[PDB]
């Protein structure tokens, strides 16, 4: 389930941020490592929301720092 979620999270991030999948690890920080900006994450989250059929709080968005954070947030909602 984590491996499923993480694989799909990684493809979406790679497709939309333009980075190579080899750079998308559990420990990668969206901004610092993968080159995103503070605007990119809300579109990513909505894409994850529609991908897995979950939704996230706007309050819980300020805590999301790494790829692993996204996966874990998704994994807990399902
Ligand atoms: Zn792949
Ligand atoms: Zn895709
Ligand atoms: Zn979107
Ligand atoms: Zn898909």
Author numbering: 3 to 80
List passages from the publication reporting this PDB structure.
Acyl carrier proteins (ACPs) are small (~9 kDa) acidic proteins that are essential for numerous biochemical pathways, including the biosynthesis of fatty acids, polyketides, lipopolysaccharides, lipoteichoic acids, rhizobial nodulation signaling factors, and pro-hemolysin toxins. As essential components in type II FAS systems, ACPs shuttle acyl intermediates in their hydrophobic pocket to facilitate interactions with various enzyme partners. In this respect, Thermotoga maritima ACP (Tm-ACP) is a valuable target since T. maritima resides in extremely hot hydrothermal vents and is the only bacterium known to grow at temperatures up to 90 °C. Its thermophilic cell membrane is highly enriched in saturated fatty acids with long chain lengths, which help maintain their liquid crystalline states at high temperatures.
Both tertiary structures of the holo and apo forms of Tm-ACP were determined by NMR spectroscopy and X-ray crystallography, respectively (see associated statistics in Table 2). Compared to the structure of holo Ec-ACP, the helix III of Tm-ACP was found to be protruded outward in both the apo and holo forms. Hyperthermophilic Tm-ACP has nonconserved Glu and Lys residues (D59 and K79), which participate in an ionic cluster between helices III and IV, forcing the outward protrusion of helix III. The interior of Tm-ACP is filled with numerous hydrophobic side chains, in which three Phe residues and I15 mediate the tight hydrophobic packing. The specific Tm of Tm-ACP was measured as 101.4 °C by DSC, which is the highest melting temperature for any ACP reported to date.
